[PDB]
Design a protein around this ligand. Structure first.
Ligand SMILES: Cc1cc2nc3c(=O)[nH]c(=O)nc-3n(C[C@H](O)[C@H](O)[C@H](O)COP(=O)(O)OP(=O)(O)OC[C@H]3O[C@@H](n4cnc5c(N)ncnc54)[C@H](O)[C@@H]3O)c2cc1C
Ligand SMILES: Cc1cc2nc3c(=O)[nH]c(=O)nc-3n(C[C@H](O)[C@H](O)[C@H](O)COP(=O)(O)OP(=O)(O)OC[C@H]3O[C@@H](n4cnc5c(N)ncnc54)[C@H](O)[C@@H]3O)c2cc1C
Ligand SMILES: Cc1cc2nc3c(=O)[nH]c(=O)nc-3n(C[C@H](O)[C@H](O)[C@H](O)COP(=O)(O)OP(=O)(O)OC[C@H]3O[C@@H](n4cnc5c(N)ncnc54)[C@H](O)[C@@H]3O)c2cc1C
Ligand SMILES: Cc1cc2nc3c(=O)[nH]c(=O)nc-3n(C[C@H](O)[C@H](O)[C@H](O)COP(=O)(O)OP(=O)(O)OC[C@H]3O[C@@H](n4cnc5c(N)ncnc54)[C@H](O)[C@@H]3O)c2cc1C
Lengths: 214, 213, 215, 215
């Protein structure tokens, strides 16, 4: 399972422990219609702890400004590329003109896209000039813009994942992280369809997952 | 099939599920064999612990409440236990065997201690039944039950928190009863993550009993 | 601040870091009354919970072990409890009063239930003393003590986790015994953070008893 | 007012503190003599009894470059409130490494030219950003062109146990020089408020190097 996001980003499923029945087993402390009914009962009454026994590992490629928002979710495990020592692809998120639709801009949205590519090209060339002259990466990389792509592994249980979808798969969140949250919701739906449907029905406080088919 | 280890007279540690193995920590450390095992020893030696959070276990444990209270102090984990208010219980209790009192100079034989423990457990359980039969709700009636009453719980924990649990509980300073439970956790962990377990015993394990037993 | 709970229990305030303005400062990332109170209500109303993590409390609680086990399930907090292996204990037990069984149709009078609970507690405690006198270590001998034995612990918790605790424990679905302790926690919280507590009751509180019982 | 300047425009400022060394002593004993209290702090540190130190809490206000704040926010056992890149007003200040930061590195151009080239690209990125804002582009999109050395501000609420884990990892020569400077300031404030815990930490638990080399 791999879903492309933005111009060069992605959300990829690395591993998963369990499925809907893992929450049923934990709720009953015991190793179809009755099991699905139990998932809905747990969700309808705020019994969230059984859902902590379903765990996912994702491999995400996202711009640093999106990764900073994501890393605010503390109840999860992260391993990211080192800005000091890792090899980077040096790819950057260049918003398409349609990203500025709805905004009354003084210049055409095409010019915004061009100006963004222009400054990232200059910052990247300056960075290369510093590396070529012997400056270590940990110092030279500080000139790189916030739209630089990074990669990380994210291990998260279904309860914390559902909190993430409540907050990020919502119109109040930045459009870029909304797109990533839609991909997380899609993989979550594929692996835990009963929990996902129950979540949308009773616990989900956001808006876009009840408007967009994932 | 899955690992199951019996502990004490009626307890057990059972493996329900596991996500990953040693290579899950290697994949997370690289964000992407002698070289893979060498990377595990390197992460362990230099204290790079976060990759080990990408290996997760789910156990089903049956333990006396006094042991479970010690276990539930490990907050970086997920728990689901039988409800003392609403769950049906087996009403089993941990009766220490006479050998548990070896080394202690007791005025009565250790066999009599075992008998006195079974005796008070029987009286508390019969009093409890008398209260339930007369309409007292379980959430009130169960408060007379002794601390050696067996409970059951699911424990979902990553390898990093599990290794912290072994440092603290698989050690002679911890109570003998929880040491037995920690040996079973260490055993299942070794079976699923042999490279991480060996690296842990070699460079990070602070206790004593895992290097003796 | 000390509030008695049950027959021998208590909730006592040991220390507190901050007040309502600590959440205001954190929300604005900056070190008047109506504007500050309006901000507390805005953050509460829209689910901006992280600012409330910058208000912290330390309580000293004396509660029966069955109550303490429910409390220790709240992992986003710090605990230090008396050791069952090595601490000196008071050997006090929670004996429910007859009024605790009101509403239940019992075969025997509620007074007899209270008596039977004191009776088995006394026998378990005497058996425990007989084991200690004969050389059995406390870590083994104490396993015969009932779940209503009182323990003591220090609880350090931030206002966000404390509000989650009130949502779950200051509610009629929770056991009556932990509800009484949650009312005392809500009371001390109200005294120290009156704006946050009022905003909490108005917009984020999911329970029922804090909107029924005067605190 | 404890405030320590870090780098060219950064700082670590103490906002509030709950407790001191005696807060860990009270939690260890579960109870609400100088030599005996200091001896207990050393005993807890020596034998790895860490939970009592969770009852001492600090709140800091930090101004650090985003590349440093990202390293700091990896410490999950803490509370954070940062300026919003989408909606907050910013000072638009950037960390320009001084020539001495490149000492020890054999560079093809003088270290002064590296500093100049960094200021140069920072100025161009900032001017491009202003051109986008002036033309109606929202800040959440326009700001993505700003470099990683842009200063941000955040409130950090952390207990002494997590703070000591942070010092173990960041107040060490293996960590990036920039975050070590911030960790030294955190250690100084910690030492001022909890001198017994800090000394005990340095004697028995600290695994880094620089806090045993720098006073
Ligand atoms: C639209 C939007 C705007 C935002 N704007 C800002 C902003 O301007 N500035 C900013 O700093 N942040 C901002 N955030 C980030 C936000 O404050 C949270 O950090 C983020 O959403 C993670 O939420 P969380 O704490 O619930 O998640 P996690 O950290 O994963 O926590 C999950 C749950 O665990 C519990 N929890 C975890 N740790 C603690 C703790 N230490 N204390 C108490 N309970 C805890 C809580 O119940 C929490 O819901 C914004 C988020 C969104 C969605
Ligand atoms: C021999 C022995 C005797 C003990 N005696 C007592 C006793 O008398 N009284 C008593 O109350 N307890 C006692 N304990 C329990 C002990 O204090 C811990 O509560 C328990 O071992 C869990 O340890 P932990 O905090 O490392 O684990 P977890 O709670 O799982 O935490 C794991 C790790 O996460 C971090 N952590 C998690 N939450 C926080 C937080 N809020 N702040 C900072 N860091 C955090 C720390 O790095 C910690 O090591 C005893 C334990 C042992 C082994
Ligand atoms: C009426 C009632 C009945 C209950 N019955 C039972 C029962 O029968 N059996 C039983 O075992 N328990 C039972 N519980 C306990 C319950 O499951 C919780 O353990 C307890 O209420 C603590 O809530 P919490 O997990 O939100 O609190 P905390 O553990 O303090 O967590 C606070 C917040 O942090 C987050 N969180 C913390 N750790 C994690 C994690 N590892 N993964 C994801 N998110 C995390 C969540 O957002 C959570 O809301 C009962 C509770 C109530 C109120
Ligand atoms: C020199 C150096 C280089 C680094 N390089 C990289 C890098 O290349 N890439 C990268 O991604 N990170 C890197 N890191 C960051 C590192 O992996 C940690 O994220 C960071 O040090 C935070 O430490 P912590 O996890 O112990 O802290 P916290 O998250 O504050 O945790 C405190 C303690 O709580 C416990 N804990 C908290 N949450 C959990 C959990 N979910 N499961 C288990 N235990 C838990 C642990 O005992 C931990 O020590 C680097 C750090 C250093 C110092």
């Amino acid at each position: 399972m791999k879903i492309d996001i933005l111009d060069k980003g992605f959300v990829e499923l690395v591993d998963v422990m369990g499925n809907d029945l893992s929450a049923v087993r934990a709720a009953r402390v015991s190793f179809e219609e009755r099991d699905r009914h139990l998932i809905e009962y747990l969700m309808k009454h705020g019994h969230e702890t059984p859902f902590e026994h379903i765990v996912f590992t994702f491999h995400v490629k996202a711009p640093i400004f999106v990764a900073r928002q994501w890393f605010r979710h503390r109840i999860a495990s992260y391993n990211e590329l080192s800005g000091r020592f890792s090899k980077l692809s040096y790819e950057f998120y260049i918003p398409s003109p349609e990203r500025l639709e709805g905004y009354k801009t003084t210049i055409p949205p095409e010019r915004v896209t061009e100006k963004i590519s222009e400054i990232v090209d200059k910052a990247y060339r300056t960075y290369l000039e510093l590396i070529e002259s012997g400056v270590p990466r940990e110092v030279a990389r500080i000139v790189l813009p916030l739209n630089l792509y990074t990669r990380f592994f994210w291990t998260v249980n279904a309860r914390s994942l559902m909190n993430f979808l409540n907050l990020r798969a919502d119109s109040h969140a930045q459009w870029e992280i909304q797109q990533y949250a839609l991909a997380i919701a899609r993989i979550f739906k594929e692996k835990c369809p009963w929990t996902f449907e129950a979540f949308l029905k009773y616990a989900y406080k956001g808006d876009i997952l009840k408007e967009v088919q994932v």
